[PDB]
Amino acid sequence: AFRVLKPWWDVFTDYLSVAMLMIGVFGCTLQVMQD
Amino acid sequence: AFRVLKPWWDVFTDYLSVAMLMIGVFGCTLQVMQDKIICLPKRVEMKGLKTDLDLQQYSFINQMCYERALHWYAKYFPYLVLIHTLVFMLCSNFWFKFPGSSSKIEHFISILGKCFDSPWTTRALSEQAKALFEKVKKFRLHVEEGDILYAMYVRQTVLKVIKFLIIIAYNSALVSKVQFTVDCNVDIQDMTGYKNFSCNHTMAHLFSKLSFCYLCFVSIYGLTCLYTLYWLFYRSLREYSFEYVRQETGIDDIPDVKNDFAFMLHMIDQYDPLYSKRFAVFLSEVSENKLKQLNLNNEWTPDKLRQKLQTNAHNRLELPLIMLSGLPDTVFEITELQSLKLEIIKNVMIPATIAQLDNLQELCLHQCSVKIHSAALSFLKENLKVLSVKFDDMRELPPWMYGLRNLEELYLVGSLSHKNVTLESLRDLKSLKILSIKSNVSKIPQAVVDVSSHLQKMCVHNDGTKLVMLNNLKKMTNLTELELVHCDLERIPHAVFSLLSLQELDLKENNLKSIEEIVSFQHLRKLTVLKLWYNSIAYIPEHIKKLTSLERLFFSHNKVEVLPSHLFLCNKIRYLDLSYNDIRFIPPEIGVLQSLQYFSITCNKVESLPDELYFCKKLKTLKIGKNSLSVLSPKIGNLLFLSYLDIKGNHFEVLPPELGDCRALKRARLVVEDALFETLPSDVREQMKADA
């Protein structure tokens, strides 16, 4: 339903998206803070 | 699932990774918070050294020299450590995060936990696990073809080792690079009026010390890998041999395991030494057999066995068995059965408990590969009297049956020639008296000669095999009853002429056409019963009158059309089978057959009945059958002892009332047309059916 529909490449893309989202949030934080 | 997969070194590596992650996060926090460079112009009673620089210039200089002079690695160290720790964690977790191997790992965890959970494992070492054996065998067949999980784990370990080596190699040189104080000569002159600056940032010494401690952790981490690497390359975990469960519990099953299975076994043993012992039980086949035995004992009750008890053909209390996987023990509790019946029961082992069933003398076996115990075999030798065996490819034949001395009657249903029969010698059968064979043997085996000293009755009913060599039958001096049914001889064999002790002769389905050997039958004065079923005989030689001892005659389903007068000279004949023949006229000489009690001419061409036939008052069975009789003589009322009459299928118009004179014949024994029976008076039919 929420797990059996994810091939390995899909899982890797999801993890890459999570990492990129974290990077973007951290970048926004630092831009607000010290830029 | 999430805990039992961690060896001690793995847990230590995880804890080191956690500590390194905490250190990296703390370093990033301090770098964001207090990592500030203070800078001053370098080259210049002591007074102050005012530089008339405003705060904006100070901050600008701090930023400029921070970008320029400060070492890149010194600035990136917290993020560097964070990245390395995250990569180590990711390469540690991808072992279970990859679904293709994660499914196998989860299946192994589930099966191991379920096997350890079963108390029947402890019972075997000392309920539903029987079906769990199927999952066990499915897993062992499917996953032993893997070993890719081991390669993946080895690759992960190699990656960790390489990362550790690189980390040490470059950090060792880079640690000495950082300094607390620093100098920067940037071209800010004529922009800020200065070029040379002395600077320092707070974290340096701390970072230095911090980095030192971090290195130590990494060092231990690397050492950990080495140990595991050595453990990977000193034991050769691709193969695992128990050699301890086999020696202690005394089980020779569970020989070895494949690369993947040995790897998982080693991992579990390092995690827990007793989990492997508990999990190995369901690999054993003997354990599976015993668990099936327990389940069968739960399924079977003595009540079920006694309900299935019945009376066999040869007047014995028998327990039929049609589909079983072994011997229930409860069967040995019921000693009143005199016979046992087995049908399609392979892999049967008879223990000494068969000695409990004292009152056993017969056994029936239908397609069963059975072996006995020593006490079981001795009990069978000393107690069995009758035995019936059915086998298809000689594999169900138990050889020890040839060693049973007290056996009396034996029945064999199975081909032996498939032309020499692979029959074992019948020497130990010291009390064999009756033999029955259902095979395709072309020549009589020599083994029977080893039993002819006490053999009394040999029955061989082949499916049509021609008995070319009958020389051994001449050795049957003690044979009193002989049957050669469907032996395809087509002539009376010369060997039977050597059997003076013979009493009853049967030649069914031999298709005898010329029988001019009846004179030789005069050499045998004990011939009371002679049988010629399903032969091509059309004429009866006069020599048959010379058989003094004849008591029964058989000519059913033959080509005899007009029967000779001299055939009636054997006044001692009591059974006369003339049905299914071309018999048309019954000669009056049948009146001299006073001793006759049987006469069947069913499915013949008989058109009239002589009155002399009714002089044979001893006739208790008369089977006219399907003939062409138009009227029945009233003299049938004189046959006071006639018990069966079969005239249905004839041309009778009205049955005579004299049928009421038949004391031994009733409605059930009277086979007549319903209209013919209706032609009888009301009193006659009332007397036949009931007692008025």
Swiss-Prot record, chain A:
Expressed at very low levels in adipose tissue. It is found in: Cell membrane; Endoplasmic reticulum membrane. The lineage of its organism: Eukaryota, Metazoa, Chordata, Craniata, Vertebrata. Disruption phenotype: Mice do not show remarkable changes in body weight or the weight of white adipose tissue on a chow diet, but display significantly lower body weights and fat mass than wild-type mice when fed a high-fat diet. Moreover, improved insulin resistance induced by the high-fat diet is observed. The chain crosses the membrane at residues 8-33. Induction: Induced during the earliest stages of adipogenesis. This is Volume-regulated anion channel subunit LRRC8C. The chain holds residues 16 to 50 of 803 of the full protein. Non-essential component of the volume-regulated anion channel (VRAC, also named VSOAC channel), an anion channel required to maintain a constant cell volume in response to extracellular or intracellular osmotic changes. The VRAC channel conducts iodide better than chloride and can also conduct organic osmolytes like taurine. Plays a redundant role in the efflux of amino acids, such as aspartate and glutamate, in response to osmotic stress. It comes from Mus musculus (Mouse). Heterohexamer; oligomerizes with other LRRC8 proteins (LRRC8A, LRRC8B, LRRC8D and/or LRRC8E) to form a heterohexamer. Homoheptamer; inactive, likely because it is not targeted to the plasma membrane in the absence of LRRC8A. In vivo, the subunit composition may depend primarily on expression levels, and heterooligomeric channels containing various proportions of the different LRRC8 proteins may coexist. The volume-regulated anion channel (VRAC) channel forms a trimer of dimers, with symmetry mismatch between the pore-forming domain and the cytosolic LRR repeats, a topology similar to gap junction proteins. Belongs to the LRRC8 family.
UniProtKB/Swiss-Prot annotation, chain B:
It is a multi-pass membrane protein. One of its GO terms (cellular component) is endoplasmic reticulum membrane. SMART domains: LRR_TYP. It catalyses: chloride(in) = chloride(out); iodide(out) = iodide(in); taurine(out) = taurine(in); 2',3'-cGAMP(out) = 2',3'-cGAMP(in). Disruption phenotype: Mice do not show remarkable changes in body weight or the weight of white adipose tissue on a chow diet, but display significantly lower body weights and fat mass than wild-type mice when fed a high-fat diet. Moreover, improved insulin resistance induced by the high-fat diet is observed. It is found in: Cell membrane; Endoplasmic reticulum membrane. GO terms for biological process: aspartate transmembrane transport; cellular response to osmotic stress; cyclic-GMP-AMP transmembrane import across plasma membrane; fat cell differentiation; monoatomic anion transmembrane transport; protein hexamerization; taurine transmembrane transport. The keyword Protein biosynthesis does not apply. Expressed at very low levels in adipose tissue. Residues 231-691 are cytoplasmic. Disulfide bonds join C39-C199, C65-C184. It holds the Pfam family Pannexin_like. The chain crosses the membrane at residues 8-33, 75-94, 154-175, 206-230. Residues 176-205 are extracellular. Belongs to the LRRC8 family. Heterohexamer; oligomerizes with other LRRC8 proteins (LRRC8A, LRRC8B, LRRC8D and/or LRRC8E) to form a heterohexamer. Homoheptamer; inactive, likely because it is not targeted to the plasma membrane in the absence of LRRC8A. In vivo, the subunit composition may depend primarily on expression levels, and heterooligomeric channels containing various proportions of the different LRRC8 proteins may coexist. This is Volume-regulated anion channel subunit LRRC8C.
